[PDB]
Design an enzyme around this catalytic site. Structure first.
Site, PDB file in Angstrom:
ATOM      1  N   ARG A   1       0.770  -1.331   0.021  1.00  0.00           N
ATOM      2  CA  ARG A   1      -0.008   0.052   0.100  1.00  0.00           C
ATOM      3  C   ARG A   1       0.967   1.306   0.057  1.00  0.00           C
ATOM      4  O   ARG A   1       0.739   2.042  -1.097  1.00  0.00           O
ATOM      5  CB  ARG A   1      -0.887  -0.142   1.057  1.00  0.00           C
ATOM      6  CG  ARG A   1      -2.017  -1.123   0.956  1.00  0.00           C
ATOM      7  CD  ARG A   1      -3.310  -0.625   0.085  1.00  0.00           C
ATOM      8  NE  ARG A   1      -3.838   0.498   0.597  1.00  0.00           N
ATOM      9  CZ  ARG A   1      -4.480   1.391   0.021  1.00  0.00           C
ATOM     10  NH1 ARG A   1      -4.618   1.495  -1.375  1.00  0.00           N
ATOM     11  NH2 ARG A   1      -4.635   2.438   0.663  1.00  0.00           N
TER      12      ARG A   1
ATOM     13  N   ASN B   1      -7.739   6.954  -6.936  1.00  0.00           N
ATOM     14  CA  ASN B   1      -7.726   6.216  -5.725  1.00  0.00           C
ATOM     15  C   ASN B   1      -6.170   5.967  -5.127  1.00  0.00           C
ATOM     16  O   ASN B   1      -5.382   5.766  -6.023  1.00  0.00           O
ATOM     17  CB  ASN B   1      -8.661   4.895  -5.741  1.00  0.00           C
ATOM     18  CG  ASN B   1     -10.130   5.191  -5.819  1.00  0.00           C
ATOM     19  OD1 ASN B   1     -10.427   5.857  -4.562  1.00  0.00           O
ATOM     20  ND2 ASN B   1     -10.781   4.680  -6.561  1.00  0.00           N
TER      21      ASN B   1
ATOM     22  N   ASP C   1     -21.304   7.104  -2.623  1.00  0.00           N
ATOM     23  CA  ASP C   1     -21.497   5.938  -1.609  1.00  0.00           C
ATOM     24  C   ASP C   1     -22.875   6.475  -1.075  1.00  0.00           C
ATOM     25  O   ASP C   1     -23.709   5.538  -0.741  1.00  0.00           O
ATOM     26  CB  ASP C   1     -20.437   5.490  -0.752  1.00  0.00           C
ATOM     27  CG  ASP C   1     -19.295   4.828  -1.633  1.00  0.00           C
ATOM     28  OD1 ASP C   1     -19.455   4.246  -2.402  1.00  0.00           O
ATOM     29  OD2 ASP C   1     -18.143   4.676  -0.569  1.00  0.00           O
TER      30      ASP C   1
ATOM     31  N   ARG D   1     -25.741   5.932  -3.208  1.00  0.00           N
ATOM     32  CA  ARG D   1     -26.168   4.643  -3.372  1.00  0.00           C
ATOM     33  C   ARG D   1     -26.886   4.263  -2.060  1.00  0.00           C
ATOM     34  O   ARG D   1     -27.997   3.631  -2.199  1.00  0.00           O
ATOM     35  CB  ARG D   1     -24.850   3.590  -3.314  1.00  0.00           C
ATOM     36  CG  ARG D   1     -24.223   3.710  -4.533  1.00  0.00           C
ATOM     37  CD  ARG D   1     -22.873   2.966  -4.507  1.00  0.00           C
ATOM     38  NE  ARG D   1     -22.509   2.431  -5.827  1.00  0.00           N
ATOM     39  CZ  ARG D   1     -21.113   2.712  -6.326  1.00  0.00           C
ATOM     40  NH1 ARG D   1     -20.306   2.811  -5.284  1.00  0.00           N
ATOM     41  NH2 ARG D   1     -20.731   2.177  -7.151  1.00  0.00           N
TER      42      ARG D   1
ATOM     43  N   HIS E   1     -13.138   6.607   2.037  1.00  0.00           N
ATOM     44  CA  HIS E   1     -14.010   6.281   0.949  1.00  0.00           C
ATOM     45  C   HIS E   1     -13.761   4.447   1.161  1.00  0.00           C
ATOM     46  O   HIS E   1     -12.743   4.304   1.049  1.00  0.00           O
ATOM     47  CB  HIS E   1     -13.433   6.622  -0.149  1.00  0.00           C
ATOM     48  CG  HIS E   1     -13.992   6.170  -1.724  1.00  0.00           C
ATOM     49  ND1 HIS E   1     -15.226   5.869  -1.683  1.00  0.00           N
ATOM     50  CD2 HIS E   1     -13.203   5.858  -2.573  1.00  0.00           C
ATOM     51  CE1 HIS E   1     -15.457   5.511  -2.831  1.00  0.00           C
ATOM     52  NE2 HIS E   1     -14.207   5.395  -3.469  1.00  0.00           N
TER      53      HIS E   1
HETATM   54  O1  LIG Z   1     -31.430  -6.919 -13.165  1.00  0.00           O
HETATM   55  C1  LIG Z   1     -31.375  -6.817 -12.020  1.00  0.00           C
HETATM   56  O2  LIG Z   1     -30.473  -7.516 -11.343  1.00  0.00           O
HETATM   57  C2  LIG Z   1     -32.008  -5.656 -11.500  1.00  0.00           C
HETATM   58  C3  LIG Z   1     -32.631  -4.874 -12.529  1.00  0.00           C
HETATM   59  C4  LIG Z   1     -33.214  -3.650 -12.179  1.00  0.00           C
HETATM   60  C5  LIG Z   1     -33.469  -3.291 -10.846  1.00  0.00           C
HETATM   61  C6  LIG Z   1     -34.055  -2.152 -10.049  1.00  0.00           C
HETATM   62  N1  LIG Z   1     -33.476  -0.789 -10.275  1.00  0.00           N
HETATM   63  C7  LIG Z   1     -33.513  -0.039 -11.349  1.00  0.00           C
HETATM   64  O3  LIG Z   1     -34.707   0.094 -12.179  1.00  0.00           O
HETATM   65  C8  LIG Z   1     -32.938   1.269 -11.079  1.00  0.00           C
HETATM   66  C9  LIG Z   1     -32.552   2.140 -11.721  1.00  0.00           C
HETATM   67  C10 LIG Z   1     -31.555   3.145 -11.276  1.00  0.00           C
HETATM   68  C11 LIG Z   1     -30.760   2.807 -10.245  1.00  0.00           C
HETATM   69  C12 LIG Z   1     -30.966   1.597  -9.518  1.00  0.00           C
HETATM   70  N2  LIG Z   1     -30.409   1.289  -8.745  1.00  0.00           N
HETATM   71  C13 LIG Z   1     -29.356   1.927  -7.911  1.00  0.00           C
HETATM   72  O4  LIG Z   1     -28.647   2.985  -8.424  1.00  0.00           O
HETATM   73  C14 LIG Z   1     -28.621   0.942  -6.907  1.00  0.00           C
HETATM   74  C15 LIG Z   1     -28.915  -0.148  -6.482  1.00  0.00           C
HETATM   75  C16 LIG Z   1     -28.348  -0.815  -5.523  1.00  0.00           C
HETATM   76  C17 LIG Z   1     -27.331   0.380  -4.898  1.00  0.00           C
HETATM   77 CL1  LIG Z   1     -26.337  -0.082  -3.607  1.00  0.00          CL
HETATM   78  S1  LIG Z   1     -27.495   1.659  -5.969  1.00  0.00           S
HETATM   79  C18 LIG Z   1     -32.183   0.844  -9.929  1.00  0.00           C
HETATM   80  C19 LIG Z   1     -32.481  -0.330  -9.386  1.00  0.00           C
HETATM   81  O5  LIG Z   1     -31.931  -1.236  -8.733  1.00  0.00           O
HETATM   82  C20 LIG Z   1     -32.782  -4.311  -9.762  1.00  0.00           C
HETATM   83  C21 LIG Z   1     -32.259  -5.331 -10.216  1.00  0.00           C
END
Ligand SMILES: O=C(O)c1ccc(CN2C(=O)c3cccc(NC(=O)c4ccc(Cl)s4)c3C2=O)cc1
Ligand SMILES: NC(=O)C1=CN([C@@H]2O[C@H](COP(=O)(O)OP(=O)(O)OC[C@H]3O[C@@H](n4cnc5c(N)ncnc54)[C@H](O)[C@@H]3O)[C@@H](O)[C@H]2O)C=CC1
Ligand SMILES: O=C(O)c1ccc(CN2C(=O)c3cccc(NC(=O)c4ccc(Cl)s4)c3C2=O)cc1
Ligand SMILES: O=C(O)c1ccc(CN2C(=O)c3cccc(NC(=O)c4ccc(Cl)s4)c3C2=O)cc1
Ligand SMILES: O=C(O)c1ccc(CN2C(=O)c3cccc(NC(=O)c4ccc(Cl)s4)c3C2=O)cc1
Lengths: 328, 328, 328, 328
Positions: free
Chosen positions: B102, B134, B162, B165, B189
């Site tokens: 590191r 990073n 993060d 999310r 982070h």
């Molecule tokens: O095919 C899969 O595995 C799947 C597809 C769509 C979804 C639903 N979905 C959205 O339509 C969608 C749109 C934009 C963002 C988004 N999810 C996220 O940005 C995050 C999920 C998990 C984290 Cl941590 S951030 C999602 C999301 O999870 C979940 C799982």
């Protein structure tokens, strides 16, 4: 009592603007990110055949989309995730290997489209098809034949990007912003494309009128060199970077915006052109189209010289030359 | 008389919102495209060391930018093309080789920043530095030391992504749009990052208040699993795709928007944190900062539990553990 | 220790895009609201002479602006609140009283501008002046003379709105979106304005070319009736409502956007036209101008028939006829 | 062959986002212009009883809308022009005459809504009703009863604007951008409205926590004066200008954006509140609601002190006091 139920009293419980991008290569993802960031879609569907890579592009895009008007974002090998798409963008294709014939490449693309297009249609029967895969004028024809869609709902990326490029150089030469310049590049995408000098203007002042030796070889200013530098620019990108992504991404996003937000804007896009310029075959070339929510609602009938008309006619022959040999 | 002079009578003859992206890898270009499409900049400058690839990314981006509020777009190996940047985004770094310590990786990043940062500063002395490379909390410290900039004009991408999310999953659990949920992930982070349960609310109704066993192990609903799934999500992208581009691109564009459009918005970004949480060393961690046209104008003093405070303090020790060994 | 100091650790402590609207009548406030909502300005300054009414319009606008990218919003009878304006919009005017002569009205407007323009210039010496007050072609001249500004930084609302209106009806007739139609209305604002048929096109296909009896009286389709309905539309608004506000508000916001965001777009705006179309007097008329951050950077030299040229020349005579009688 | 047919080959031939504004007074038109400029609607319908004035406001708005994503804009005394509205904004009502009782005014508003609401419903049965007319909490109840709509599709402008105003002063006091401050004003619109101190935070750091004597009389910093200055600000606008237009216009546009673009954002809007805070009557007050394409999808259950709860309960009594006397 759960935390959800303590915090939220709920009263209530289908997308209207779904877009599918088929292929999540450089171009596909450039289309996808460019479409997200114009907030065009309430649902975005990604489809490719490499399953692990597809899901990663979906997740990475999902995570970024948290900083936008976040749509639903889905992906799969199976086309059932593309159901009720208003617009489907085909980027999938085969790249020409060295010493492969033009005809052979198109037939490999045809064999791919024979899997893709029927699956797209099965699940989104009233969608518009936007074809980006090269060679685009032939593969638009291929998607039209396989889909059995009317000519208005099958569009090729065409000369939208080449025309933008032309107008940039036009601008640089006149000392005018590109968006204040007007002028089309029509016909077969790349090399054989025709700069239409008759209809090139700034604020409605025709350049042809002020300098009648514009398109010609006896042109003191050599405007022929503009259309040359447009085509060289396409190649110099591929030589230096390996491929083009961003340019086609935004060119496609531009066309998607016109369709999805029903802007009824004019784009020089590949569409079925039998009837015009003495062409009797089922070929697609770029002519100015009004793009709206039902795809191509109107063509703008451009008056072409006999030179311009012949250069198109010659492209239409070359293209039918390959199209007639294809096996569906 | 030329066609330009026949058509246009001219009356008249420096950018105010120039952004430089250093590094045109996946992340750099994702930043660049995401910044173009938010129309944040009148000039965009790309800098990397592979000259032929750099010029291709510039040209491809140029060509696409014809379908936007087109800024000036330039590129070079030489930092003179970055002159008068309001904001410079550093994505350049070394990736850890097999068996490399590191400490050794950070020192190689240090030796790179010893070429980059002084060149950036030479040509854009009043810029804001946004560090994406990073490990980001240490490399922000590195850029701060080398630049001799005040702590307000040196910012790390930090826990901005993060936290976004986290809030998404928070939303999914409460049946509430992510943007109606509030809640930070602070500190180092990734992995060591601290979900701050005290300040997690919807419409100002504290979740801690309604369900006082929120962060804890005796939590019936197991909200600990949320911060876990945030960190697993980062990895699952890299496993499936190879790398993350889009997510950091848009996370950086979000931070760039706040700075360039002086939004005075709150982001959990890496900044100099000596004074707070019983930390006496020059370390950078993510705490909520007001981002505006002068970078970090204000911090928000978040009250943390002894657990939260200790987890930060432990990260600050680990980080100073490496920082004290570095040779400038 | 105060609550502010317990919550916020502060690190830090001039607008770059300030706009002043002079006059808070219907038109002034329509300009102001339309400019707020395009987020063009970081500071907005309102100036009128009725102090109690001014402060109320400021407060009402302030309160609404909480739902936008909120700028600073100030007001005063004293012009010191207009300091460092990039753009100053003059809407202030006298309205013609019953039995007042045209010449007398203009001279009352002149006597007002003799107080306003020197105060505007005192506090914002490098601003662009956008003149909206009627009669606009003369009052632009008046502001030019009093200000001693170069001709590029003094612009009149001109035929920007009439041209938009023309293109709408053009569109309705061709079954084409107004924004896909091109065509100018030039010269003296209202009645005497000249539809320029030579430069009217869709996608660069000249209408004059397809239908050479376009502008003429022996026109089967009677396109003369379009320019007539444009002028009747101005009046029918005043007859039915009492005044026009919204239309000029958005027409001015359009011109402000081009200047403030340096779009280098073409607008048919009142500018100093001595040199062109055999006009030797210091008169202002609407010709196509490139508007950018330094005001009018370029004119587009439109080729006009001898009829069109004479109709302009006649307007220039009428206008100098009044201008020469004014007392400064 | 016509010019249209020579220029345009046509291939093809209902609005999805129609908004009706009822009343084209100051407030109505401020709503209308503010909705146009957020490009929320593909069709905008204006309805009032003074026919000549209505048509003038329509035409003036039409002409300005040429500089936007132009929707269809229609007007009429007859409600048939409001057909298939997704959202209908009621601004129509009676202003209290001198010596008229509170109860009598509400009954005259009721008798007006007995003409308006059934006509709105006849032609747009699946619309959302947004009530702006004062007194807004009672007239929302009135529109709910007459319409027979479910409680989710009937919303009052409520305390959306008062809360924005509160947050501005909150910001000024903490030296923080208003949009980084959170805090609601709930209950009866104006005077009786309750500042909710419990849920006032910056970046999730509760102000109540840092300064537990916040709402109280023994508050050294006197935050009570903030809610006072919010209510005085409403009046000082009316004293100085005569009326408020812009502020309610943009406050309503904000609510319309959340509904029309399905943002699922939180607004303190008048909705049916029977069940909460020991209120057993059909009264409407402002509580935080998630606004989306189906109107109010969810409430956020805010925990209130006994003081806060009593002040609401007292408002609910006063309001049912009048509601029970009304004749439908
Ligand atoms: O095919 C899969 O595995 C799947 C597809 C769509 C979804 C639903 N979905 C959205 O339509 C969608 C749109 C934009 C963002 C988004 N999810 C996220 O940005 C995050 C999920 C998990 C984290 Cl941590 S951030 C999602 C999301 O999870 C979940 C799982
Ligand atoms: N298409 C166009 O270009 C149109 C332009 N107008 C112009 O807009 C102008 C204003 O009309 P409205 O605002 O609609 O109504 P208005 O005429 O009531 O308002 C103009 C304002 O000018 C103010 N004023 C007078 N002397 C002043 C001074 N010394 N300093 C600052 N302000 C002063 C008045 O108090 C008034 O509020 C008019 O002069 C008219 O000529 C009007 C209609 C159409
Ligand atoms: O690295 C170089 O050699 C270089 C750098 C900047 C420029 C100037 N420049 C821009 O700043 C810029 C911004 C956006 C677009 C753009 N150019 C174009 O899109 C096209 C150029 C040539 C074609 Cl063909 S299209 C340009 C462009 O050419 C030219 C060359
Ligand atoms: O001339 C005055 O009386 C004056 C002018 C500007 C200001 C400062 N100022 C802004 O610049 C500004 C921009 C936008 C909104 C805004 N104020 C408000 O929205 C509110 C003020 C009071 C309440 Cl309550 S809300 C303000 C504001 O108060 C204060 C007093
Ligand atoms: O109630 C009426 O009398 C009426 C209603 C709709 C229409 C059609 N219509 C629009 O929907 C619409 C939207 C936006 C603008 C607009 N009209 C114009 O822009 C112009 C008309 C005449 C000139 Cl000049 S510009 C129109 C317009 O004319 C015409 C008359």
């Amino acid at each position: 009592a759960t935390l959800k139920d303590q915090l939220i009293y709920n009263l209530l419980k289908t997308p209207q603007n779904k877009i599918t991008v088929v292929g999540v290569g450089a171009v596909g993802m450039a289309c996808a990110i460019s479409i997200l960031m114009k907030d065009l879609a309430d649902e975005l569907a990604l489809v490719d055949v490499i399953e692990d890579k597809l899901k990663g592009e979906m997740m990475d895009l999902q995570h970024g989309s948290l900083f936008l008007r976040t749509p639903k974002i889905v992906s799969g090998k199976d086309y059932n995730v593309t159901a009720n798409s208003k617009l489907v963008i085909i980027t999938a294709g085969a790249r020409q290997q060295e010493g492969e014939s033009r005809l052979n490449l198109v037939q490999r693309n045809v064999n791919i489209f024979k899997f893709i297009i029927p699956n797209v249609v099965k699940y989104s029967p009233n969608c518009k098809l936007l074809i980006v895969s090269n060679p685009v004028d032939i593969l638009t024809y291929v998607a039209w034949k396989i889909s059995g869609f009317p000519k208005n709902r099958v569009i090729g990326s065409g000369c939208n990007l080449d025309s933008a490029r032309f107008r940039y150089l036009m601008g640089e030469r006149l000392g005018v912003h590109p968006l204040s310049c007007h002028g089309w590049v029509l016909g077969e995408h790349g090399d054989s494309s025709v700069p239409v000098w008759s209809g090139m203007n700034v604020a409605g002042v025709s350049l042809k009128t002020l300098h009648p030796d514009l398109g010609t070889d006896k042109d003191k200013e050599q405007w022929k060199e503009v259309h040359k530098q447009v085509v060289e620019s396409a190649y110099e990108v591929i030589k230096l970077k390996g491929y083009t992504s961003w340019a086609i991404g935004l060119s496609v996003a531009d066309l998607a915006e016109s369709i999805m937000k029903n802007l009824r804007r004019v784009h020089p896009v590949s569409t079925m052109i039998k009837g015009l310029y003495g062409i009797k075959d089922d070929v697609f070339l770029s002519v100015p189209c009004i793009l709206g929510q039902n795809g191509i609602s109107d063509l703008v009938k451009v008056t072409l010289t006999s030179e311009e008309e012949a250069r198109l006619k010659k492209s239409a022959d070359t293209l039918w030359g390959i199209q007639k040999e294809l096996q569906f």
